[PDB]
Amino acid sequence: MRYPSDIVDQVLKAGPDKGLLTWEGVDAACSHCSRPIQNGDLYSPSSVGAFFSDTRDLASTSRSICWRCVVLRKKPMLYGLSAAVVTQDGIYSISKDVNKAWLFTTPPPAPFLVVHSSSTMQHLSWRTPVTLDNRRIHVRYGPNLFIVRPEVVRKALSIADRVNEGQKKWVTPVYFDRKAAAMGHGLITRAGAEMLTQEEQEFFQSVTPGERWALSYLMHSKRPEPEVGECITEKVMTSLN
RNA sequence: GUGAACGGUGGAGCAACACCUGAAGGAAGGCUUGAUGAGCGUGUUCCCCGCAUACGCGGGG
Ligand SMILES: [Zn+2]
Numbered sequence: 001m002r003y004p005s006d007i008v009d010q011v012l013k014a015g016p017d018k019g020l021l022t023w024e025g026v027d028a029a030c031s032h033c034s035r036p037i038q039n040g041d042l043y044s045p046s047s048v049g050a051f052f053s054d055t056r057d058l059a060s061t062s063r064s065i066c067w068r069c070v071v072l073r074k075k076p077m078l079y080g081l082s083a084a085v086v087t088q089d090g091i092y093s094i095s096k097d098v099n100k101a102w103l104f105t106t107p108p109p110a111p112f113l114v115v116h117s118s119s120t121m122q123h124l125s126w127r128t129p130v131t132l133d134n135r136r137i138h139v140r141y142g143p144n145l146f147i148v149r150p151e152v153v154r155k156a157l158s159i160a161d162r163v164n165e166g167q168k169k170w171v172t173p174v175y176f177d178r179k180a181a182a183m184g185h186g187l188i189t190r191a192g193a194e195m196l197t198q199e200e201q202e203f204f205q206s207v208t209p210g211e212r213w214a215l216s217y218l219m220h221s222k223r224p225e226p227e228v229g230e231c232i233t234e235k236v237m238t239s240l241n
Numbered sequence: 242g243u244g245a246a247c248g249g250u251g252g253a254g255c256a257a258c259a260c261c262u263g264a265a266g267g268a269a270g271g272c273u274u275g276a277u278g279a280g281c282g283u284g285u286u287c288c289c290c291g292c293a294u295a296c297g298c299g300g301g302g
Contacts, residue, residue, distance in 0.1 A: 056247060145244070 001088060001111045004126050005033040005068035011086045011113075012233050014240065016042040016067040023064075030066040032073070033126040034059030042067040057127040057143075072125045076239035081125050082117040084232065091233035097217050099229030104153045104214040106226055107134040118142025118179065139210050144180065146210025153214055156207065160219060163195045170223070174204045176216035186212050 001010060008014045020042040029036045030043075037043050046063040071077065083095040085103055088110035094100050103114065111132050115124035118141050128140035139146040164170050173192030177185035186209075188201055196204070207215075218224055 001130060001132075003033050003035040003068075004113055004128055004130055005030070005035050005066060005072055006130070007086045007091075007113060007125070008068035008071045010088070011091055012237055012240075014068075014071050014237075017044075017070060018042075020044045020067050020070060028062040028064060029060040030064060030069055031058045031060050031062055032065055032069040032123075035066050035068070037062070037064060037066050044070050052123070054123045054127065057123075059127075069126050071240075073123070074240065075121075076236065077125060078121050078123065080232065080236035080239055081115045082121070084115055084236075085229065086113040086115075086125075088112070090231050091236055092229040093232045094229055096227075096229065097220075097224040098227035100214065100217040101224040102226040102228050104137070104148055104150050104218065105157065107137065107150050109134060112137075114139040116141050118144070137210075139213070141180065141210075141213055144209070144213075146213055147208050148210040148214045149208070152207055152211050153218070156204070156211070156215055157218065159196070159200055159203070161223075163192070170221040172219050172221075174215075174219075176212050176219050178213075178216045180209065180213045180216065185216070 021044065023037050023039060023041060023043050025039075027036055027038065031046060044065045044067070046065060065073065081091070083093055085092050085094050085108070087108050092099070094103050094114070094116060111130055113125070113128065113130050114137060115128060116139065117124060122142055124140045124142075128145060129138045131137045135149055135151060137148040137150065139148050160173055163173055171191045172189060173196055174186065174188050175182075175184050186205065186207075188196070188204060192201075192204075
């Protein structure tokens, strides 16, 4: 519940691969997940391929992967956590917009860990911190480390439901990009320029990029009700074995 | 040791093909280069204006 690699044996039960070396000597942190490798725990020397391009998100330059993050670099872990929230009892999916509606509005009370892929297969699990508090959520989205406050998401959603109550067409006040890629991601629309007051506009610039990315999955004409995502920890474990 | 440090928006692509500014329409009706200025009458002291300042000068008809 402290390091992102803890879910290897806390969220989902797993063990070392038994071809891993035993650490002898002084303390050194794992290159992935920033977990200190003590004396006696199993570790692997660093054998990343040339296709690994996340050297900028490595926690340390010790060139040693802890066994939990050896499990975390496995391909079934890589496509199993392409969109997943890992609570203290299981791994659930956030692929649907109703699942992100559940995650960023009334979050689960566990100290979870949120990963989401901005591409096909990405190293997501180890390079994000564990969110200890529901109010402050660390979301990994591709090369982006995002922080989402569900209270600010609730305030923006209440603002949007106020300015779009009674109207026939649900027009968004501020445009949000799902990929977080367009220039106008966070830019105020003309309808939102005419239908929001000044302090609401400064609020919509003042939100964090993670809240913008979350609102991108929950600001559209059909509004997703918070529905808990389907539990996928059985699918990941079966794939892992 | 600025959640830092590192990171090319890139490569290629014909605005081009054909198209009559053209048809019709009177610069005319009337008007002396001919004159005009070229030569033809008065016969002796009479008014008025200035410079002067009256010794005289210029001058109107
Ligand atoms: Zn690790």
